Every structure is written in structure tokens, then in C-alpha cells.
Design an enzyme around this catalytic site. Structure first.
Site, short mmCIF file in Angstrom:
data_model
loop_
_atom_site.label_atom_id
_atom_site.label_comp_id
_atom_site.label_asym_id
_atom_site.label_seq_id
_atom_site.Cartn_x
_atom_site.Cartn_y
_atom_site.Cartn_z
N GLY A 44 -10.14 10.19 2.32
CA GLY A 44 -10.99 11.37 1.45
C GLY A 44 -12.16 10.56 0.99
N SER A 46 -7.43 5.40 5.64
CA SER A 46 -8.27 4.97 5.28
C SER A 46 -9.04 5.22 3.86
CB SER A 46 -9.66 6.52 5.39
OG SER A 46 -9.35 6.72 6.67
N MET A 47 -9.46 5.89 2.38
CA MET A 47 -9.15 5.70 1.13
C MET A 47 -8.06 4.92 -0.02
SD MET A 47 -11.76 5.04 -0.99
CE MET A 47 -10.33 4.95 -1.97
N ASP A 95 -11.16 4.37 14.59
CA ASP A 95 -10.04 4.34 13.95
C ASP A 95 -8.91 2.49 14.16
OD1 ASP A 95 -8.98 7.69 13.50
OD2 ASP A 95 -10.69 6.36 13.14
N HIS A 132 -10.28 2.63 9.45
CA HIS A 132 -12.33 2.63 9.77
C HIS A 132 -13.57 2.68 8.56
CE1 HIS A 132 -12.25 7.37 9.03
NE2 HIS A 132 -11.11 6.05 8.20
#
Lengths: 195, 179, 178, 196, 178, 200, 196, 196, 178, 178
Positions: free
Chosen positions: I55, I84-85, I158, I109
Site C-alpha cells: 500500500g 511490498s509495504m 517483483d 519490489h
């Protein structure tokens, strides 16, 4: 997709549609729903045909699910008005307004193909007319008039009593080609001419 | 719920609001409230504050009949706006106890509606318009003290009244004031 | 509900908010609140915080009449923005107890609306506009202390006031600072 | 679907529609709703027909549910303005604006088919015009003018009093072809010419 | 309600959040909360956590004025993001008690808006932009300690600050660490 | 539905519309709303007509509810620019921009039919222009310019004072054909040429 | 609605539009927004006109609210590339990309009508380009290039300094026809030729 | 709006567009996005031009933002296949697929105008292909094939190594006309050829 | 509310969830929760269960700073997915107390985003990307123990990790089992 | 809330439902419930009623790991329908305590998904499909007692089981009749 084709002659060579070739032969095709647009087109074709040759017959091919009452009357008036006799031929269906028109051809000259179908019914208003009661009462009045005019003019052409029409059309009334003849809406039922 | 809670507390003070378009839904709640209040204390007044643009006649007559059948008196206050059914219900308050706030507007007019269907169906709808128009006029005449002929005439189109004018016309008994 | 609960607690402190577009719905609730508070303690002031862009005249007048008829005084605070009906209602606060927060903006202008039907119907609507325009001006004149001619003229199009300017025009009695 | 056809002559051979053939005979068809677009088309046709032969009559076939007021007046002004006489013929319906036009043909030459229907009513505005009151007051004023202009110009052509028109059009007023003649909107009602 | 309940418990610890776009609605609640907390304990600090992308100026000034007029001090914490009104309000915290979390981002820029009506109406809107632009700059200058000319210039387009940079620019007094 | 027809002559036989027959006679029809598209079509027609015969008059038939300001000016400049005189004729309505154009015909040659209607008003922007204040201030400025340019160019053609125009157009101003003549927007009001009522 | 008309001659009789007649006279009309489609049409017209007569001048009528940068450059390259001189004439507006084009006509031959309007501004991207940061940085880079190319090529034609163009276009810059001449975007301002 | 015009000759008088005149001169215009429809039109044009005169050169004007891979290959195969030499000319942009096509002209005959722009990048699929994993794996495979085929065919025409292309196109790669020449995508950069 | 009530009961057991996309809204609630728990018992651990697709960075950094500044330790559990986050926050858990469930997937990523506006506005956005990209990499480097050059490289597209792989990369300290 | 209240009362009877599509949201709540129940009574069984069409693998694996790591046993009941993840989770119930209701249907098949992006991005997605497909098959093989080759083959397309068939395949230990 609607093909066009060409006609040989000693004079010259002309391109035409089926609908044009039909019109060339004094046949007007009533196939859509009788909206205000289409009605003008029919009247114009009628008026033009009269102008081109007032003595020869006009024939009207009918396969229409019906249409506007205001338009019905305008077409009707035009049919009756022109000098030429009108021959009406129901090919598939002549419903609602179209039925009245079918019936409104010149007597002797109203026809249908055998599995044709004629439907009569009283004027409906799908969708809603909104308004002050004063406006709605005027409207309602005008609709009763419209209703009784349909009944008058069918009565005129069918040889039936106006009140009888009203009874028979209170609800939907479906007629086979035979039945339609009995009812006085058409004169003859076309028999097939195959060899 | 803060608004609910606030109305509640007023409800227990025998104060009710007609603050919106008059639906079946709004009408039913009002009718329920009047029923409940009557059943609680059948002697004490009910105060009906009205700020409504009008609405369904059917739904409005539910409220009206419920008002009339109540044992207790029903006081009506016109605040901000009492239009159409809103005006009717205002004027239907128990006589002597119909109030207008000084800058409230009252709107009287004839019924609106719609027409659809078969010519037969429409003939019937129309017949009914006659019955209803007549009756609604008869009643406003009774409430106001005016002759039915004037109610008919004035009601033909939107007819606007200031608190002042509403008093003289007979929609309302008093105008409220302080300083 | 956390917001409801917070307003509630303020409500019991005799503090009410006009924090949005002025509808029938909002107006009614406000009118109820003022009715409820008066009925509780008819002597103590009510504080009406206003942060509104304006709204329905009809609905605004419900609030105004309710304010006027209340027994107790009604103090008005202009916070953030008091526009149109918002300005009107601010200026309608009981004289001496109308406040502006220092960076609040006040907006005065003439009524807007719509025109709908038959020519006859429209003639009627128009007639009503005249009445209303006139009356709303008359009242803003009364609140501010200005002549109706200046209220008419200034109100013709959007007319913006800082807290400072609003004080000298008469929408408001004091500016708060502390 | 609208057929075309061909016309023989010793000069040459030409293709035409029914609408064109109608126009070739100085007949203009007023069949849609009188929007600003259609109105320009009607005026242009009128103006062109005059330019082509200013002495011969122009005929106007009317089957229209009505239309814009601003357009009505423009068409009207053009009808009256051209050198040629205008013959108006109501086939079907001449409602609202179309009624005035029907009425506005040159006296003696205004007609309708027997089950034709003429409806008159005052100018409405469906949809809403939004604005400051100042703007709305100006607007309302202009609409009262427009209204009374409709009444003036009907009065002119029907031989009725303007105030009477206003009384009669306050609400919708529907006229049979006969009634329309009595009212002074048309001169004659066309009888059918069937040979049988 | 779990979130409401969690904020509630913080609220009673004198901790409030500006966690979203700044509307009239969000502003009013904040203003109510600051009013309520001041009224409870007028001596103790209020902590205002800010994670907002910015919003309505009008609505933002309601909050600012409410902050200024509060009796108690208002400590401001920039967490995650303090943008536009968010930055303004952060910088409007009582001097000495304005904090940034270490990876928070601050965004300073000039006002955005819209232009609508008749040329006359637009002339008026424009006039007001001038007033507002001027005033917002004047205040950021005051908060930061920078000259109005640098505020004008830097604010012309998006101007990003890391917590570090924000400290040296004067949006914030401290950066928090442990 | 718009008919076409044919014209006889000893030279040959040609097919045309009403609009084409109108153009053949140096009449340009201004009937839509003056959008950027239509304006180009008008300018091109004007320029072409000039190129075809610079001495003969161009007539402009006007029944338009108005239109874009940027377009107004372009059309105007072209009207004034071409060698030929311009005759303007209001048939129904000449509103907003269309009013200025009507007024901008060559003096002596500006007309209207009797129940025509001329409406003038200052430039509006329906819909919203969004932006940074810096952008908006620029925009606003440009609009004040546009406004005062409308007032200038009307003043030029009506004989009125620019400041007076501004006052009269602050709000909408509706003019009958007669009133429009008085105002100095048209020169004459066309009387009907019917051959039958010519006995008066 | 755009009329066509016919041209007499001793050779024969031909039908044409105004736009065709304009083209027949080596005038290309730049009236829409400069989308990729229209740009091709402009280039093709330019290329064809050169092919038809490389010595005679091509004139470009400009009333355009602007358009795509990728297209601007293509048209420009074509304008400069063809053998024939290019005469640019601003009739109403020449905004954004259109401005550069106006400016990019051959020196001596750039014009505007008096109330014409020229607007210059730096390249915007309404709508959003989405992506990984690596992709967005490449994109951004390409946009800075595009920007500085606009500034280079205006500088070339106006006689101004590139850096000065950048200062002046950071925000929108509107120019009257007179101002535009001063700025070095056009050479002359057309005066009206009315015989009276 | 795209004008037509007429061409004099002692033989007769013919009407044409710019696009037709262009085609008459063996110039095919590649201006839209290379969708399956447009690709067929390009191939048919190519094939027809070959049939009409197999010895004379065909020129392809390119200003295209790119397009479908399946189409790219088809067009490519047709370009290479026909007897006639293909001359490619980038007028504005040749992006994505279009870049490969530009490159795929016959050696010696690949060109660009000076501010033209060439962009290469690997095949993307915006929008989603949904499916069972078995289906998706087959799909993924085919898309790696498609990718490596783009790289092969560029390598063929640029004189570069396939692996180098892959590296350079892993991300978007934008080329000025000069750069594009260095890269081996075009042979020459067109200089403006105007008389002054 | 049954779900609220269930989380509540866990919340009192010092267990919090990051179970969705990381918004300002989700971030704020988490930050509030960590604040509230620290204030309750400043010595006991907080358990942060993470099952999130990633996010907002801004919003994520609110959570991250709030984690770092907390007095107590923050244990992080990767369950189902930490992307991610989600991965970043997982890896930000206090060293030693970062866990992965055995079939959890971790996704690393580089940032994504958008570009819009004037060329000048875009130039600015771009500049910001540089700053942020750099910083996010710096931090992941710190968390994992990897060199920033590898974080850059591996993050380019990714990059998927099983629990096993994540352990050896340094996102996580332990894998939980029984 | 009547439904909430009903589930609540069951929840206190250590009965949990997986009654819908398997999202992150549903998974999280289930994971929380299992956590909460274990923490209450770590010795008593948990009953997991499953009527689900399947869903997110990621989300499903959160539930699975949470099941495996729980101290107490987890009984699984297939009611109405246990499809895809639903079948997987059913089969993942503690051995011996996996039940099917007599007219329940079980559906086994391979993963579905999507492919998007650059060819490079897709290559990566694809790689991951391989990993996931393989492991999900490995695990169903483990649960059922079938060889991975048959799981692969049978799973290729929708594979339907009646309670009866599910027992013999090894998804389930018992069928309940009484």
C-alpha cells in the site's frame, strides 16, 4: 443487407432496390412501427403517387406491429383523401393502428395472406403523463375521444356497430386472416398462386 | 443516535415533527407516534411541528384521520414551510391551536398526479381524480372557513401565503412571537 | 457513535453546530435542539457555532424563527465560514452576542433558485422571488444596521468579508482573540 | 426506408424522393418537432422557393407536435415575409407552435384533413432554468413577453381578441378540424376526393 | 465501534487525529474535540496527530482559529504525511511543541481551486484568491519564521520537505527519536 | 430531412440544396451554436466567397443562440477583413456572440425580421476551470480582457460608449428588433414583402 | 452544415467545398485539436502540395486550441522539410502546440488577424501515467527533453533565448496579435482590406 | 476534415485525396495504432502495390504509437516478402511495433525526420489474461517466444546482438533520430530540403 | 460487532493486525493502537500480525515511525502474505522478534506510482521518486542486512520469497513450527 | 446483531465457520478466531465448519498455517460444499477428525489466476505459478495420502466428489450419519 439490381431497356439502364421497384409499381410498404417520422414518409409517398397518376390504384403492404394514434389518423385521412383507390394487403401482422389502416382500404380491395394476423385493441399509454389534475382531466378527456374515434372509424369500415367494437376491443382481440374477413376488416384472403 | 436521541427527548415532551416529504413511511411513523402518545396520556395535547413540501395524499389522510381520531387535542405549528399536504395537515390541527411561526410560508394548490395505461384504466383514474379533488377541497374549505368555490379557484395553481395572509385565510389561528 | 458522542457532550454544554449545507433535515434537527435546550433551561444562553456554505431559505427561516422565539439568548460564532443562509443566521444571533473567529470568512449575496413550468406557473414563481428577495434584504438590513439600499447593492453578487470587515458592516458584534 | 424513383421526360431523366418531388411542387414538409435545426431548414426552403419563383404559391404540409418558441417566430416571420402566398395544410396534428404556423398561412389558404387535430397551449418550459433571482426575474419577464407575443400573433390571424386567446390557452385547448375552423385557425376543412 | 473505541480511549488521553482530507465535516469534529478538551481541562496540553493530504482552506481555518483560541497549548505531530492544510496546521502548533516523526513528509504549496461563472462573478472570485493567497502566505511566514517572499516563491509549486528539512525551514520544532 | 432539387439552364443541369443555392447567392447561414468547428466553416465560407468575387456583397443569415468567445473574434476579424461588404440579417434570434456579429456587419446593411430577438450579455463560463490560483489569476485576467474586448467592439459598431455597454450587459439584455435598431445593433427592420398584402 | 458550390470555366465545370477550394489555392486548414490523426492529415496535405508544385508557397491557416507534442514536432519537421515556403496565418487562436507552428512558418511570412490570440505554455499531461518508479523516471526524463525541445525550437524561430522562453512559459502566457509580433512569433499583423 | 482536389492532364481529369495521391506514388501511410484491422489494410496495400509494379519501390510513412504483436509480424512478413524494395520513413514517432517496422525497411532505405523519435520496449499486456495455471503457463511461454522473436528480428535488421537488444528493451528505450541511426534502426536522417 | 469484538479481545492481548491494503485509514488506526498499547503497558511486547498486499508509502511510514518510537518491542508475524509495504513493515519488526509462518509469501519490489501535470510539476514528482526510492532501499538494506546495491537490483521487479528464502535474505529472524 | 449473536454463541462453543469465498478479510477473522480460542483453552478441540466455494491461496495459507500452529486439534466439517481452498482446508483438518456431512460435495482442482504486465513481469508470475501449483499439489497429496501424480492429473480440471468418494480418496476421515 438489401440488394440492388439493374433493369435493361431500349431507353436506358436503371438501378433500383426492391423497395423502389415496389414503389415504381405503386406499392407503399408499411413495415415499421407507425411513429410520427414513418407516418410522414407514408403520407408523402401516398400524396406523391396520387400526383404522379391520380387514376391508377395505390397498394399498401402492411406488416406492422402498430403505432401512434395521432399518426394513425393522419395516414388514414390521407388514404381516404387521395383520388386513387387504395388496396390494403396484410402480409404478416397488422396490429393496433395498422389494423385500422388495413381495414381502411377501399372496400373490395382489403386483403391478407392466410397465416396473417390482425390484432385490435384500445389505445394504451405506456409511460406516464404527469400533471396537475386539471391538466390530467383534459388529457383523459382527449384520450376518451381518441378511443371513441378509433371505434367510430373501425365501425365505418367494418360495417359493425361502434358500441360492439368498443366491447370487442376493451381487451386485446386477435384475428386470423379468416376471422378478420368475417369481422369485416378485410374483404378477401389471398390464396397462394404456386405452379 | 444523536438526532434520534434528540427527537426521542422531544417525543417524551409530546412534540412530533413532520419535517419532510410525506411518504407512506413518514406517515406511518407519525401515525404510530400519535397512537402511542394518545395511549400514554389521553388528556394532554400533542404538538405537531410541520416543515414539509407536501407529499402523498393517501399517506397524508392516514395522518389526518389519525389526528382526528386521537382523544387528545393536536396543536399544529407551521415552521419554515407548510406546503400542499403540509398546509392541509397544518390547517387540520384542532381549531384554536393552529400556529404559524412569523416567517413560515404556506402553499395551497390542487393535486398533481399521473395517468397511464389503457384508455379504460385511465377513464377510471380520471374518475378518481374528480372524487379526490372534490374531497380535498371540501376539507380545506371546512378547515379554513372559506367557501369551496374559492378553495377551488385559489387552489388552481400555486397559491402562496405569508404567516399573516394564512391567518386571514383561516389556515391557522395564531401567529407566534417574542423578543 | 464517536462523533455523535462528542456533539452530545457539547449539546449538554448548550453548544450546537450548523456545520453544513442548510437542508430541511439539518434545519429540523437544529430547531429541535434549540426547542429541547430552551425547555431544559430557559434562562441560560445557547451557543450556535456556524460553519456552513448556505442553503435552503425555507429551512433557514425555520431555524431563524426558532431562534427568535426561543426564551433564552442565542450566541452565534462564525467559524471557518458563514455564507449566505450561514451569514444570515450568524447575523441573526442576539445582538451583542454575535462573534466571528479571526480568520472566518463571511459571504453575503442575493438568492438563487430555479424557474420550471408553464408561463403562468413561472409568473407565480417570479412574484414569489420578488417577495422573498425583498424580505431577506429587509432582515439583513435589520441585523447589520445598514440601509436596505446598500444591502441590495452589495448582495447583487458574491460579497466577501473578512472577520474585520464583517464587524464594521454589522454582521457581527465582536471578534474573538485569546 | 424511403424509396426513390425516376422521372421520364424528353429533356432528360431525373432521380428523386418523395420529399424532393414534394419540394419540386413547392411543398415544404413540417413533420418533426420544431427544434432550432429544423427551423433553419424550413426557413431556407421557404427563402429558396421564393428566390426560384416569387409569384407562385408555397404550400406547407404540417404534421408536427410543436416546438421551440424562438424557432416558431423565426419561421413565422419568414412565412409572412416572402413574396409568395403561403398555403398551410394540417395533415394529422398541428400542436403548440405548429398550431400558430398553421394559423399563420395566408387567409383563405389554411386547411386541415377532417380527423386532423389542432392543439394550442401556452409556452411551457420543461427542464429548469437555474440562476440568481436577478437573472430569473429577467428570464421570467422575457417569458411573459413570449407568451403575450404568441397570443398577439394568434389573435392577428384568428380574428380573435388577444385576451380571449390567453383565457383559452391558459390550459391545453384541443380542436377538431371543424372546431379549428370555427376558432379561425383554418379556413376550410378538406373533404376527401376519392373517385369512388 | 472498534476504531471509534480506540480513538475515544486516546481522546480521553487528550490525543486527537487529523487523519484524512480536511472537510467541513472533519474540521467540525476536530473543532468540537478541541472545544470539549479545553472545557474539561483548560491547563493540560492537547496532542494533534496529523496524517493528512490537505483539504478545504475554509475548513482548515476553523481548526486553526479553534487552536489559537484554545486556552491550553496544542502540540502537533506530523506522522506519515502533513500536506498543504496539513502542513499549515502542523506549523500552527504552539511554538516549541511542533514535532515531526522521522520519516514524515511535509508538503507546502499555494492554493488550488476553481473559477465558474459570469465574467463579473469570476472577477470577484479572483479578487478573493488574491486575498486568501496573501493571507495564507503571511501566516506560513509567521509560523516558519521565513520571509513572505520565500514562502511565495517556494509555495509556487509542490515543495517537499523531509522531517530534517522541515526542521530547518521552521515548520516544526523537533524531530522525535528513540 | 432537407430536400434537394435541380436547376435548368442552356449550359447544363445542376443539382443543389437550399443551403448550396443560398451559398451560390453569397449567403452564409449561421444557425448552429458558434463552436470552434462551425466558426472555421464560417470563416472558410467568407474567405472563399471573397476569393470568388471580391467586389460583390456577402450576406450572413443569423439565427444562432450564441457561442464561443474565441470563435466570435475570429469570425468577426474575418468579416471585417474581407474586401467585400457584409450584410447581416437576423432571422430569428441573434444571442450572445451572434448578437455582436449581427452588429458587426457593414453599416447600413444590418437587419432583422420584425419578431426577431437580439440578446446581449457578458461572457459566461458554464462548467469549471480548475487550477492553482496562479493559473486561475492568469485565466481570470484573460477573461476580463475578453469581456472588455466584447464591450469595445460592440461600442465600435453600435456608436455607444464602451462603459455603457458594460453596464447594459452586466446582466442579460433582451431586445426586440425595433429596440435593437435603437440600440444601434441593426440599421433597418425588414418589412414583409408579401405580394398579396402589398395593397397597403 | 457546409455548402458546396460549382466553378464555371471554358474547360469544364467542377464541384468543390470551401475546404477544397482552400486547398486548391495551397491553403491547409489547421482548425481541430492537433491529435495524432489530424497531424497525419496535415503532413500528408503538406507533402502532397510540395509534390504538386515545389516552388509555389504553401499557406497554413491556424485556428487551433493546441494539441499533442509528438504530433507538433512531426508537423513542424514536415513544414521545415518541404521545398516550398510556408506562410502561417493565425485567424483566431493559436494555442499551445499551434503557437509553435504559427511561429515556425518561414520568416517574413507569419501572420495573424488583429484580435487573434496566441497562447504559449509548457507541456502538460492531463490524465495520469502509471508505472514503476524506474519506468516513471524514464518517462519524466523524456518529458523534460520534450519541454526543452519546445523551448529550443521556439527560441530558434522567435530570436529569443531558450532560457527566457522557459521563464515565460513556466506558467501560461497569452499574447495579443501585436504582443505576438513583439515576441517574434509572427512577423506582421494583418490589417482589414475592406473597400470601405 | 481532409480535402480533395483535382489533377489536370491532356488524357483526362481525376479527383483524389492526399492519401490516394500518396498511394498513387507508392506511399503507404502508417499513422494509426497497429490494430488487427489496420494491419490487414497495410498488408493489402503492400500486396496490391507489388502486383501493380513489382520492380518499383514502395515507401512506408510511419507516425505510429505502436500496436499489436501478432499484427507487427504479419506486416513485417509481408514487407520482406514482396518483390519490391521497401523504404521506411519516420515522420514523427515510431514506437513499440512501429519501431521494428521502421527498422525492417530494406537496408539503405530507412529514414527519419530530425526531431523524429523512436521508442523500443518489450511486449506488454495491459489488461489481464485470466485462466487455469495450465492455460496461463502455455500463454506465458508463448509470450516469451513473442518477446524473443521481437529481439531476433530487431537484431537481424540493426546488426546488433539479440541479447543486447533484450537488455536495452528490458525497460523503455527512447531514441532521437540521430541515436536511432547509431542504433542501426535507420540509415539516414533526412535533412530539411527547403529553398531558403 | 462480532469481528470488532474478536479483534478487541486480541487487542487487549496486545495483538494487532495489518490485514489489508495499507491506507491512510488503516495506518492511522494501527498507529493509534500502537500508541494506546504503549501508553497502557510500556514494557510488554506488541504482536503485529501482517497479511497485506502492500500500500501507501506515506501511510506505511506512519506505521513504521510509530513502531520505532514505541517504548516497547514490536514483534512481527508474516501470515499468508507480506507484500511490498507489508514486507517492509514485517522486516521493520524489532530484531530477533520477526517471524514468518511456514507458508507465508514475502514480496519485495520497488515503488510504483503515477505522473501527471505540467512538465514542471512532473520534474518535481520525479525528483521525489528519487528521494523515496533511495530511502526505502536504504531502510530495507538496514533491516535485512543486505547491501543497498542488492536491494536495488533484486527490487527492480517483483521478487518472491518463500518463508525459507526470506529467512536467509534477512526479512525475518525465525520461522514458526509445530 | 442477530446473526453475529448466533455465531458468537457458537464461537464460545469452539465452533467456527468458513461460510464464504476465502478473502484476506475472511481469512484474517478466522485466523484471529483460532488464535483467540487457542489462547483461551489450549487443550480443547476447535470445530471448523466449511461451506465455501474456494478463494485466495495466499489467504487460505494464512488459515492453514494458523491451523497447523494451533496447540489444540482442529476438526473440520464439510457441510453443503467444500470447494478448492475449501477442500484443501477441509483435508488439512487434524487427521482422524475430518468429517463430511452425507450430501456435502467436495471439489478439487488446480489453481486459477491471471497474467498481466510486461513480458518480464509475466515471466516472473509464471515462475511463481510453477512453485505454487507444485506445493499445493504436494500438500493435497500429503493430506489425502494419494501420490502427487494422481493429485496433478485429477486436479487438471474440476474434480467432483460425493461424501462417499471423498472418504475413499482421503480428503476426509469420516462421514457423519445420526
Amino acid at each position: 443487407i438489401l440488394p440492388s439490381f439493374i433493369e435493361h431497356s431500349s431507353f436506358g439502364v436503371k438501378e433500383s432496390n426492391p423497395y423502389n421497384k415496389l414503389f415504381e409499381e405503386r406499392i407503399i410498404f408499411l413495415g415499421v412501427q407507425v411513429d410520427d417520422a414513418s407516418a410522414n414518409d407514408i403520407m408523402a409517398q401516398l400524396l406523391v403517387l396520387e400526383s404522379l397518376d391520380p387514376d391508377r390504384d395505390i397498394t399498401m403492404y402492411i406488416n406492422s406491429p402498430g403505432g401512434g394514434f395521432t399518426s394513425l389518423m393522419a395516414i388514414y385521412d390521407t388514404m381516404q383523401y387521395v383520388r386513387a383507390d387504395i388496396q390494403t394487403v396484410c402480409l404478416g401482422q397488422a396490429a393496433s393502428a395498422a389494423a385500422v389502416l388495413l381495414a381502411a382500404g377501399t372496400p373490395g380491395k382489403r386483403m391478407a395472406l392466410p397465416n396473417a394476423r390482425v390484432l385490435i385493441h384500445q389505445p394504451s399509454l405506456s409511460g406516464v403523463i404527469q400533471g396537475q389534475f386539471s391538466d390530467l382531466e383534459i388529457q383523459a378527456a382527449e384520450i376518451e375521444r381518441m378511443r371513441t374515434l378509433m371505434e367510430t372509424t373501425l365501425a365505418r369500415h367494418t360495417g359493425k356497430d361502434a358500441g360492439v367494437i368498443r366491447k370487442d376491443t376493451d381487451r386485446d382481440k386477435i384475428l386470423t386472416a379468416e376471422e378478420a374477413k368475417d369481422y369485416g376488416i378485410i374483404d378477401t384472403v389471398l390464396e397462394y398462386r404456386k405452379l | 443516535s444523536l438526532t434520534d436521541s434528540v427527537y426521542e427527548r422531544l417525543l417524551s415532551e409530546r412534540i412530533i415533527f413532520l419535517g419532510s416529504e410525506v411518504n407512506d413511511e413518514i406517515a406511518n411513523r407519525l401515525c404510530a407516534q400519535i397512537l402511542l402518545l394518545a395511549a400514554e396520556d389521553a388528556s394532554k395535547d400533542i404538538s405537531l411541528y410541520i416543515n414539509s413540501p407536501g407529499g402523498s395524499i393517501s399517506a397524508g389522510m392516514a395522518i389526518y384521520d389519525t389526528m382526528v381520531l386521537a382523544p387528545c387535542d393536536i396543536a399544529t405549528y407551521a415552521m419554515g414551510m407548510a406546503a400542499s399536504m403540509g398546509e392541509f395537515l397544518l390547517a387540520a390541527g384542532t381549531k384554536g391551536k393552529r400556529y404559524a411561526l412569523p416567517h413560515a410560508r404556506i402553499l395551497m394548490h390542487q393535486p398533481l398526479g399521473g395517468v397511464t395505461g389503457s384508455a379504460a384504466d385511465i377513464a377510471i383514474q380520471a374518475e378518481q381524480f374528480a372524487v379526490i379533488k372534490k374531497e380535498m377541497f371540501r376539507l380545506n374549505a371546512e378547515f379554513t372557513g372559506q367557501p369551496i368555490e374559492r378553495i377551488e379557484a385559489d387552489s388552481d395553481r400555486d397559491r402562496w401565503f405569508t404567516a399573516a395572509e394564512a391567518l386571514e385565510y383561516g389556515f391557522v389561528d395564531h401567529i407566534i412571537t417574542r423578543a
